[PDB]
Amino acid sequence: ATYKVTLINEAEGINETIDCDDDTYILDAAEEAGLDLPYSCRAGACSTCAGTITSGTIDQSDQSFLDDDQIEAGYVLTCVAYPTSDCTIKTHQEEGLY
Numbered sequence: 498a499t500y501k502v503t504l505i506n507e508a509e510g511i512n513e514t515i516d517c518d519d520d521t522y523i524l525d526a527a528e529e530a531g532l533d534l535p536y537s538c539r540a541g542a543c544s545t546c547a548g549t550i551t552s553g554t555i556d557q558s559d560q561s562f563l564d565d566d567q568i569e570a571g572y573v574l575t576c577v578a579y580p581t582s583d584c585t586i587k588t589h590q591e592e593g594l595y
């Protein structure tokens with residue numbers, strides 16, 4: 498394991514702290530753990546799984562849907578994200594997306 502990634506959307510209950518590695522897509526790291534987050538496509542071709550990495554670093558790469566401005570303003574498409582350090586994420590941001 499390597500990274501402790503905390504996941505919160507205070508108003509949704511989720512306020513767990515999970516261990517992830519720099520090779521586990523945060524989405525899966527969170528589902529091993531038993532809290533069940535958002536996802537549809539599981540491939541960077543959408544937005545349902547979106548979060549805003551409050552502080553820290555991630556690698557999206559794999560993403561096909563978020564455009565630059567959206568990634569500069571904190572949007573993470575969790576499902577295909579690998580943690581790059583420790584990071585706290587807000588779990589559900591699609592209503593607010595664009």
Ligand code: FES
Nearest residue numbers: 537539541543576
């Ligand atoms: S579930 Fe569609 S990009 Fe994450």
